[PDB]
Amino acid sequence: EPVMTGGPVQGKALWTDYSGMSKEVQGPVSQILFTQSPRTAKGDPYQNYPHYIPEGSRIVLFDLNTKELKVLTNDFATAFDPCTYWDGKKFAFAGVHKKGGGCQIWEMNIDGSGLRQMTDLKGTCRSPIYYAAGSIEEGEGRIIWRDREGDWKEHGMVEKTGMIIFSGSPEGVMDEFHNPYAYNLYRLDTQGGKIIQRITGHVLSGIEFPHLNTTIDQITYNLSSNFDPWLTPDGNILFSSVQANGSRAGGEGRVMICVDNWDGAYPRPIYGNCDGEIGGTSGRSQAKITFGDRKIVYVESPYMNWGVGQLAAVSWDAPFNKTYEKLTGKDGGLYRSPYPLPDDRMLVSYAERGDFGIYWFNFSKCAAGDKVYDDPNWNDHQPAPVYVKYKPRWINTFTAGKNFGVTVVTYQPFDQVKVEGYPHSWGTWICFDTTLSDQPVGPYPHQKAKNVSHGDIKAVRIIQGYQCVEPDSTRFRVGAGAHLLGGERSSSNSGTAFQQRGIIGYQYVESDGSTVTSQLSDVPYYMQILDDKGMSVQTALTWAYLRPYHGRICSGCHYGSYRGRAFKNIHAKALYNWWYDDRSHYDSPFAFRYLKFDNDGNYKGVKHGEDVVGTTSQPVEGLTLDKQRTVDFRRDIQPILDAKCAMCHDSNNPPNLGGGLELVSVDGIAAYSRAYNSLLEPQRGKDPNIGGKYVNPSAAINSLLVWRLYEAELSANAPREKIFPIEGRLLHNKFLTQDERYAIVEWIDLGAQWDNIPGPDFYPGYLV
Amino acid sequence: EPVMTGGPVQGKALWTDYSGMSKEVQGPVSQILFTQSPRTAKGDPYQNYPHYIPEGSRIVLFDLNTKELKVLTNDFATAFDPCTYWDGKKFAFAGVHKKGGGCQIWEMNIDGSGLRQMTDLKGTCRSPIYYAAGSIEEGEGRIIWRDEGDWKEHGMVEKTGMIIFSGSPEGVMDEFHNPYAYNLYRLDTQGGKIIQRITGHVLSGIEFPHLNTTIDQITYNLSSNFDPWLTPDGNILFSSVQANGSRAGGEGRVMICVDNWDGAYPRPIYGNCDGEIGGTSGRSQAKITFGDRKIVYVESPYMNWGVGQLAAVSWDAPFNKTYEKLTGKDGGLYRSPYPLPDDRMLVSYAERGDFGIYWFNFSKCAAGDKVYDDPNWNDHQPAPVYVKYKPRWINTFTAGKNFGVTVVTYQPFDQVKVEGYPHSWGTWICFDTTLSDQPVGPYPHQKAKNVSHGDIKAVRIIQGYQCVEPDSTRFRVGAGAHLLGGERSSSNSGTAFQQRGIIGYQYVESDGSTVTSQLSDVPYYMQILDDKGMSVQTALTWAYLRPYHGRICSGCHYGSYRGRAFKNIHAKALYNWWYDDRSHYDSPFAFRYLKFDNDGNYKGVKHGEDVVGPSGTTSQPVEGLTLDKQRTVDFRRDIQPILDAKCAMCHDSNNPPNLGGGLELVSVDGIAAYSRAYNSLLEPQRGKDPNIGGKYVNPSAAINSLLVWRLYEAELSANAPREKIFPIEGRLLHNKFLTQDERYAIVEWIDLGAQWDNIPGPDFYPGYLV
Ligand code: HEC
Ligand code: HEC
Ligand code: HEC
Ligand code: HEC
Ligand SMILES: [Ca+2]
Ligand SMILES: [Ca+2]
Ligand SMILES: [Ca+2]
Ligand SMILES: [Ca+2]
Numbered sequence A: 001e002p003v004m005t006g007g008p009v010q011g012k013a014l015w016t017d018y019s020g021m022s023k024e025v026q027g028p029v030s031q032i033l034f035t036q037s038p039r040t041a042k043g044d045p046y047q048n049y050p051h052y053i054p055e056g057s058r059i060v061l062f063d064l065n066t067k068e069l070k071v072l073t074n075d076f077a078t079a080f081d082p083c084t085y086w087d088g089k090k091f092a093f094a095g096v097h098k099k100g101g102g103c104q105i106w107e108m109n110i111d112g113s114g115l116r117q118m119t120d121l122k123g124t125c126r127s128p129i130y131y132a133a134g135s136i137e138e139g140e141g142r143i144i145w146r147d148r149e150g151d152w153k154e155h156g157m158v159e160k161t162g163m164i165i166f167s168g169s170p171e172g173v174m175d176e177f178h179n180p181y182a183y184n185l186y187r188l189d190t191q192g193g194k195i196i197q198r199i200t201g202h203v204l205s206g207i208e209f210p211h212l213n214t215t216i217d218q219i220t221y222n223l224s225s226n227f228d229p230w231l232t233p234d235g236n237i238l239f240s241s242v243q244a245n246g247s248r249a250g251g252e253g254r255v256m257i258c259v260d261n262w263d264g265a266y267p268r269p270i271y272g273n274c275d276g277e278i279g280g281t282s283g284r285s286q287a288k289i290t291f292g293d294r295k296i297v298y299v300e301s302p303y304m305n306w307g308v309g310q311l312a313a314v315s316w317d318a319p320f321n322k323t324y325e326k327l328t329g330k331d332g333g334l335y336r337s338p339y340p341l342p343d344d345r346m347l348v349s350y351a352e353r354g355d356f357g358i359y360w361f362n363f364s365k366c367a368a369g370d371k372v373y374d375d376p377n378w379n380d381h382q383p384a385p386v387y388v389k390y391k392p393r394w395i396n397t398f399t400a401g402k403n404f405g406v407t408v409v410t411y412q413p414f415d416q417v418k419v420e421g422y423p424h425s426w427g428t429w430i431c432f433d434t435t436l437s438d439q440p441v442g443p444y445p446h447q448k449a450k451n452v453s454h455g456d457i458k459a460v461r462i463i464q465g466y467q468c469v470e471p472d473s474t475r476f477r478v479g480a481g482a483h484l485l486g487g488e489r490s491s492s493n494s495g496t497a498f499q500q501r502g503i504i505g506y507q508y509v510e511s512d513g514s515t516v517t518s519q520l521s522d523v524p525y526y527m528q529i530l531d532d533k534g535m536s537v538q539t540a541l542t543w544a545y546l547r548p549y550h551g552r553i554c555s556g557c558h559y560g561s562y563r564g565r566a567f568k569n570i571h572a573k574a575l576y577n578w579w580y581d582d583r584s585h586y587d588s589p590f591a592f593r594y595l596k597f598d599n600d601g602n603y604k605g606v607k608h609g610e611d612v613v614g615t616t617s618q619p620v621e622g623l624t625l626d627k628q629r630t631v632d633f634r635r636d637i638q639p640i641l642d643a644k645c646a647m648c649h650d651s652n653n654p655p656n657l658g659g660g661l662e663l664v665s666v667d668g669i670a671a672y673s674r675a676y677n678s679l680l681e682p683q684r685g686k687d688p689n690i691g692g693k694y695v696n697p698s699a700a701i702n703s704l705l706v707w708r709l710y711e712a713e714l715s716a717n718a719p720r721e722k723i724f725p726i727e728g729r730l731l732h733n734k735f736l737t738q739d740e741r742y743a744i745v746e747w748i749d750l751g752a753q754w755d756n757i758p759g760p761d762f763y764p765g766y767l768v
Numbered sequence B: 001e002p003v004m005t006g007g008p009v010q011g012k013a014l015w016t017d018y019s020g021m022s023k024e025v026q027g028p029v030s031q032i033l034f035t036q037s038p039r040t041a042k043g044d045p046y047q048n049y050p051h052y053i054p055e056g057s058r059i060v061l062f063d064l065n066t067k068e069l070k071v072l073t074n075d076f077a078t079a080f081d082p083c084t085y086w087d088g089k090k091f092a093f094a095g096v097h098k099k100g101g102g103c104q105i106w107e108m109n110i111d112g113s114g115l116r117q118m119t120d121l122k123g124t125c126r127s128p129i130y131y132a133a134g135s136i137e138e139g140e141g142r143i144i145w146r147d148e149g150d151w152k153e154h155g156m157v158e159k160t161g162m163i164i165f166s167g168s169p170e171g172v173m174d175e176f177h178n179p180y181a182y183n184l185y186r187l188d189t190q191g192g193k194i195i196q197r198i199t200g201h202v203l204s205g206i207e208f209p210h211l212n213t214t215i216d217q218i219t220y221n222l223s224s225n226f227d228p229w230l231t232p233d234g235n236i237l238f239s240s241v242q243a244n245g246s247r248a249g250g251e252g253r254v255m256i257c258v259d260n261w262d263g264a265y266p267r268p269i270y271g272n273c274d275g276e277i278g279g280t281s282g283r284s285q286a287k288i289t290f291g292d293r294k295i296v297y298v299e300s301p302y303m304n305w306g307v308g309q310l311a312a313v314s315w316d317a318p319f320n321k322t323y324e325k326l327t328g329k330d331g332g333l334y335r336s337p338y339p340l341p342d343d344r345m346l347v348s349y350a351e352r353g354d355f356g357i358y359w360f361n362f363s364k365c366a367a368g369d370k371v372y373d374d375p376n377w378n379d380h381q382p383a384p385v386y387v388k389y390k391p392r393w394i395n396t397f398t399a400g401k402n403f404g405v406t407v408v409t410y411q412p413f414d415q416v417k418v419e420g421y422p423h424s425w426g427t428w429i430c431f432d433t434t435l436s437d438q439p440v441g442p443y444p445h446q447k448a449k450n451v452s453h454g455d456i457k458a459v460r461i462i463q464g465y466q467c468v469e470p471d472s473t474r475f476r477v478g479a480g481a482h483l484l485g486g487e488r489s490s491s492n493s494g495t496a497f498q499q500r501g502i503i504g505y506q507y508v509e510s511d512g513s514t515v516t517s518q519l520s521d522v523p524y525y526m527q528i529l530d531d532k533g534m535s536v537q538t539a540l541t542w543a544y545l546r547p548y549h550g551r552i553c554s555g556c557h558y559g560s561y562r563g564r565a566f567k568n569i570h571a572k573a574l575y576n577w578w579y580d581d582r583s584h585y586d587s588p589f590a591f592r593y594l595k596f597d598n599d600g601n602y603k604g605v606k607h608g609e610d611v612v613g614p615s616g617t618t619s620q621p622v623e624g625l626t627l628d629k630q631r632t633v634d635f636r637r638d639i640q641p642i643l644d645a646k647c648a649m650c651h652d653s654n655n656p657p658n659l660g661g662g663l664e665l666v667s668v669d670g671i672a673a674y675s676r677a678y679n680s681l682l683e684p685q686r687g688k689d690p691n692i693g694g695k696y697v698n699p700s701a702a703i704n705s706l707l708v709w710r711l712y713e714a715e716l717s718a719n720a721p722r723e724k725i726f727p728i729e730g731r732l733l734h735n736k737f738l739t740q741d742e743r744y745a746i747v748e749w750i751d752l753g754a755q756w757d758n759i760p761g762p763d764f765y766p767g768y769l770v
C-alpha cells in the first residue's frame, strides 16, 4: 500500500516509500524471537538502564501456532537485545558467553547454528542493529579506487552484508551522573573493513578486530550515554541520548529522542530535549516507528534510568507537542520493548501485576490485548517477530573512520594525522547568525543574559569536555560539594554540576553575527557567544562533535534550524571565510588560544598561542591535546586571591578568602579550600542551577563577583535585591589586572570547577 | 526511652512524650495483621488510589513464630485497611459484606469474634483509625451539661474513642473528573454520647441509629483527602489533593498535611509549595517514626498510584534540608510502610512484582528479610499487633453540622434550627493582605504587581461548586481540549477551573488587615483586589470553616501556616471582629456587590437582596447564607448577551476575535460545547503557557488579560500578555463601549476562571447534548 507517497499502481507502493514497501514485503508472521530474564534485581536490572546486562537471561524462539519454544542461547551465560536480519534467517544480539570475554555483539542463524562473534572490546556492548550500506541486493559488490594521478580501477569483490550499528561503553569511565558507564554509538564493518572499502575506497579506520574479521568506528562522542539505536524511514539512525551537560534542565538533564547519520555526521534532536515539551525528566527508551500512521513509539519511564514504564507516541513527520500521545496509558501495569509491525499490529511486553509477558497491543482499548506467551518463572520482554525487513536507503559517507576524511572533489580517502601530518583530526563549523535565537532574556545559562544585536557579539568561546576518569578511589569522592551549588551531582573535582572542561579556543565573530572556525574532531565540545568584555551571553549546553574533515552548519543559536524550523536564508560574511583556496581542504581560521583587550578590558582581538604547527592556508593551532589550556582554581585562581584578596577578606569581612589551599572539612568531607567554599556558597531564594551568592556557573556576566570586579551592572539579571552597599562602599575594579580578572571570568564561564585536571594530580584535593 | 523531652529517671520517658512512651508501652510483637489482594487490575486497583476497593481481598492474621495463618474476614467479599485498637485485642477496617451494603467501616476482635458495622453511608468508606477523645484510661465517663443555670451530671458513657476515616459520596466528580471525591469524617462510636460527653450535646451530622453510630464531615476539599493517621502532638496526619483550577502547572499536587480531628485548623506539612521536592509525585500512606521522628511516606511516580518508592521528611522540621530517599536502588516497588517503636519497620515490597511483607533495612536503604510472601497474593498493609500509646485529644468547639460551642459558657448551639440562620457560619481574618513570600509574576498564585498598604481595597470570596452530572447526555469531558483547559476541560468550562460562584466581597483596612463572617462547612478561597476591583493574587486551594469557628493568618501565603513563625502585627481588623458580649461575632458578612465612582475606581461594598428567627446573636446584617440565592457569573446568561449587544456588530470572521453567531454551538473536533465568542476568547496563544492565559483571556487573573487591558485601555499589570498590544495604526478606543456593570461583569467572569456553564447539573441554557 502507498503510505508516504503514491505508487506505480492503485493500491501499490513506490520503492522509494519505506513504510509502504515494508507493508508489501512483510509477509505472514509465524515465529517470534524474545528475551526471557530471571526475575531478580540482578536478573532484570532495568533500573540501571541504559547499562543493562540481565545476567542469566536467554533468547528464545516461539511458534505462534505449534506453541513450541526453543532456547537458542544455551551456550551463553547471558543473552539479550535480539534484532533480526533483513531476510529473517539470522539475527544479531548482545551477550556474554560461558567461556567469558565480556558482554559483546554476536550473530546467529534463526535455526541456532552459525554463531559468530562481532566484537572484542574492553567494555560492554549492547543493542546491535543492521544497517545495509552499499548492500541493497544480495550478492557480491565490486571494490573500485583511484591509482594515486591515475585512473579508476577495479580491485576485488566483497560479499554485501552491510554494517552493524550498536551502543557500547568503555572500561573504567564515569558519565555526568557519576555512573560507572558512558555509552556511545559505533558502526561496525561485517566484512572486516572491506564494506567501507567498497563504499569509500579505503578500509574502515577505528579499532580493528582481525581475529573476528571486523572493524569498529565510534560515530557519537556524547559524554553521557547514547543508546537503543533504530532505523528511520529516510535511512538514518534513531536513538536515545542523555543530555546532562552541567546544570541544564534544572540540574537534572533530559533523555531525548534524536537521530543521526550512520557515520554520526549530522546529529539532530527529534523530541524531548527542549523547554516546553512533554515528559520532563521521564526516561525515553526503546523507540521505534509505526509503518501505517508513522508514529514514533517509545517507552516513557517515570525514572530517567528505568527501562520499564508507559508507552508514548509522537508523529515522526511532525515531532511536536500537538502530535504527542500517551498510548498506554493507565491501567494498571508496566510496559516495555514495543515492536510495531508493518501491518499496523504491535507486540509489547506487559506486566499487569509485576510480571512481564509478550502481548498483542490493542489500540482501541489503549492497552494490552490477547496474550502471546508468558512463563510465570521468567520475565518475558523484547519481542522480535520474524518477517522480511525492507532496507532503508543508505546515505553517502565522507569519512572512512578515525582520522580519515574523504575529499569532496576526487572522493579520495585521506589520513589527516599519519599522512597529512596534523596532530589530530580536525573539522569545521559555521553559524550564520549567532545573535539569532528562540530563547528569551533570562537568568538561566542557556538563555540570554542581555539583548544582543549584530555587532554586539564580538567572539565565541569553544570548550571541550573532559571525561571523568578516576582510577584511584581514595582521591575521588562524589558529593563533596553537596553544601554548594552542585548538590548531589557535585564531586571532589567541582562544587557544581559541571564536570571537568578546557578551552578549545576563541574565534572572532563578523559584524553580521556570523562565524566559522576549524577545530578538533571526534571530541565532545560546545560554544558560548561573547560580548565586548568577552563574557558568555548565552551558553549552548549539549555535546557537539565533528567527524574528520566534516563541516557543520547552523542558522542561529538554538533558532530551530536543527529542531522545528526551516533554515533561514542568510547571506553571511563567514561563508567566504570558509573554503576559498584550490590547494586546501579548509581555509577557515583555527581557534585562537587567547583574547587581547584594551586598557579598559574591552575586547580588541584574538591572540595566537604557541601551539601553532600545506592542505590549509591558515596557521594550525590547538590540535595538540597535551597543550590544551584550561583554568584550574588551585593553579590559577587561588594564587590571585592569596595575593590581592585574602589580606583584606577574613572571617570578619565575607566572603572569606583566606587560608590558602588548605582544605576545609564540611560534613566530614575535606575537598576544597576556604575561598572556594565561600565563593560557591548558595543564596536564599535563588535556584542553585542559576548560581550562588557570588558565583553563577557558566555565566560570569550574571555573577555578583564579576559585577563587583567590574563595578558595573553587567546583565539584565540582578544577582540579588541589594548589590552595591550605600555606605562603606569600596571600588574593586582597580585591584586586579585584566589578565587576572578575565582569568576569573574564564573560570566562572567554564563552570567554576575546582579540579580541572582529569585524574589524580599533585595539586591539593580529597584524600583518604 | 525519652525522645522529645527528658524523663523522671535516666532511661525512662515522661508521659507527655508520645514517641517516648510508645517505646515502653509497645510490648513484644508475636503476631501481625495484613491485607491479601488478588493480583489483578481489579483485585489490586492501586492506580485508582485513593479510591481503592481491592475486590476479592481478605484480611488475615499471621503468627511470626508458629508460622500459622488465619482468615478473619471470610464473611466479607472484600476486606482491607486494617487498623489495630490501643490494646491490640481488636481492629477496625473497610469491607464489603457478602450480603451487600456497599464498602463500609467495620470493626472486630483479633480472634475473629465481635463483628460490628460502623457505617451505613451512601458511598464508599476506607482507612479508618482510632482517635481517643476523652478516652485515655479504660472505663466509663461522665456526661455533664447546663440548663440562672447550673452544671449537672446526666449519666455515663463507655469511653472507647472516635473513628476518623476517609469517605466519598456517589454520583460525584472530583476536579480531575474522576467518579469520586473523598473527604475526612469523624465518627462517634457510642451514638453521639462521646461527643455529648465532651461538648454536652450529641454529634450533629448524619446519624446511624441502627448501628448506634454518628458521622460528621471535618474536611470539605473538592478533591480527595485520604490516608488519615496520628501526629505525635495529637492531630490528624493525611494526604490532600490540591488541584484547584490551573494550580501547579495545571496538574496540581498531592501534599502531606495535618488537621484537627474536628477539622478546625488544617495546615500544610510538605509537598504543596514551589521549591519543594517531588513535583507531581503522589504522596500517600504517610506514617511517623518514633525514634528519629520522621514522616515516612509512599512517593508514587504517578499522582494516582498507591505504590512507588519510600520518601521521608522529619516531622519536627519538614523542609527540603531534611528530605531523603529511602529506596529505589533495587528497582522494586514499595507500599504500606509501618514504623515500629522499636525503630523497626514493616514494608510491603515487590522486587520483581510479587508484593509481600518484609522487615525493612535502613542500612541497606532497601527491603530486608522476608516475613510472609504468598505467590498467589499481593501481601500489603501490614499492621502488627501491640499496645499503642494514646495521643493527646484536642478540645473541639463544634458539635458538628450546624452546631457551634460558645467560647464563654461552653454551651453547644444549633445556628440553623434554633437561632434561625439560613446556614451555619464562621469567620476569618488576615492581618496583612499585602504580605507574601510570592514574587511578581504571570501565574495567578503570584502578584500581578507590587502592592503596599492601601493598594488592596477589598477581597473577593469564592465558593467552589462540586461537579455533579447525573445525565451523561448533557456532560462531556475534554470538550475544550483545543482551549486553555486541555484534557482537564469539560462541557462546563474551557479552562481547568470547575464551576464556582461568589460567596461575596469584603473591604480591606488601610493597613492591609481584613476580617469577615461567611458560610461554613463549604469549600472556598479568596482574592485580594486593587482599586479597580481586580484580583492581584489568588489563593489556589480549598479552605473550610467549621460552624462558629474562625481562622487567623498573618499574611497572604506569608508562611505563617507553613514554615514561619507568626509575625507580631497590631491590626485594625482585630477590633472589627467581636466587640459585643451579646454576640458570637460582630464582624460583617460578605457583601454581594461593589460600588464604584465615576472613574470606575472602588468606592466600597454593597448589600444584596439576601438579608435576614433570626436572633440577636450578631450586630451585623445577615447576608449570603442562602445557598439557593448565591450569585455566580454564567457566560451564556450574563456575558454573551453583552457581547451580542455591544460587540458582535464590528466583530465577525473578518475582524478577530469573532464574537458573532450568538449562542449557537460550534463543533470542534466532533464536539459542540460552546459558542463562537467563547471559543474565540478562550483561544490559546503561541509561546504562552495556557496555564497562564490565552490570547484574550487569563483565567483567574483579569488584570493580566488582554481583553481587560483593551476594555480599560491601559496597562493594568506588570505582566504583558504579548509584545504588540496597542496598535499604532487604525486603533479604536474600547473603554467607552461598555457600562461599568457590564465591564466588571466580564472582569468577574475572568477572575472566576472564565467558565461557560457555571450552573451545576443540566439546565435550560445552551450546551452539550447527545
Ligand atoms: C580581590 C580582587 C578581592 C575580591 C575578589 C573581593 N575583594 Fe573586597 N571588599 C572590601 C570591603 C570594605 C567590602 C564591603 C564594601 C563594598 O562591598 O564595597 C568588600 C566587598 C567585597 C565583595 C561583596 C561582598 C558582598 O557584598 O556580599 C566581594 C564579592 C569582594 N569584596 C571580593 C575590601 C577589600 C579590600 C581592602 C581591605 C581588598 C584588597 C579586597 N576587598 C579585595 C577583594
Ligand atoms: C466597531 C465600532 C467595534 C466595536 C463595536 C467593537 N470593536 Fe473591538 N475592535 C474594533 C477594531 C476596528 C479593532 C482593531 C484593533 C484596535 O485595537 O482597534 C478592534 C480590536 C479589538 C480587540 C483587540 C484584538 C487584538 O489585538 O488581537 C479586542 C480584544 C476587541 N476588539 C474586543 C472588543 C469587545 C470586548 C467589544 C465589545 C465591548 C468590541 N471589541 C466592540 C472595532 C470594534
Ligand atoms: C549560541 C550559544 C548557540 C549556537 C552558536 C549554537 N547553538 Fe545549539 N544550543 C544552544 C542552546 C541555548 C541549546 C539548548 C541548551 C539547553 O540547556 O537546552 C543548544 C542545544 C543544541 C542541541 C541539543 C538539541 C536541542 O536542544 O535542540 C544541538 C543538537 C545543537 N545545539 C546543535 C547545534 C548546531 C548544529 C549548531 C550550528 C553550529 C549550534 N548548535 C550552534 C545555542 C547555540
Ligand atoms: C492572598 C490571596 C492570600 C490570603 C489572604 C490567604 N492566603 Fe493562603 N495561599 C495563598 C496563595 C497564593 C497560596 C498558594 C496557591 C498555589 O500554590 O497555587 C495559598 C495556599 C494556602 C494553603 C495551601 C497550603 C500552602 O500552600 O501552604 C492553605 C492551607 C492556606 N493558604 C491557608 C490560608 C489561611 C489559614 C489564611 C488566613 C485567612 C489564608 N490562606 C489567607 C494566598 C493567600
Ligand atoms: Ca512472564
Ligand atoms: Ca584531578
Ligand atoms: Ca505475595
Ligand atoms: Ca449546568
Ligand SMILES: [Cl-]
Pocket (backbone or CB within 6 Å): A554, A555, A556, A557, A558, A559, A560, A561, A562
Ligand atoms: Cl539554529
Ligand SMILES: [Cl-]
Pocket (backbone or CB within 6 Å): B553, B554, B555, B556, B557, B558, B559, B560, B561
Ligand atoms: Cl501567612
Ligand SMILES: [Zn+2]
Pocket (backbone or CB within 6 Å): A273, A274, A275, A558
Ligand atoms: Zn533545545
Ligand SMILES: [Zn+2]
Pocket (backbone or CB within 6 Å): B272, B273, B274, B557
Ligand atoms: Zn504554598
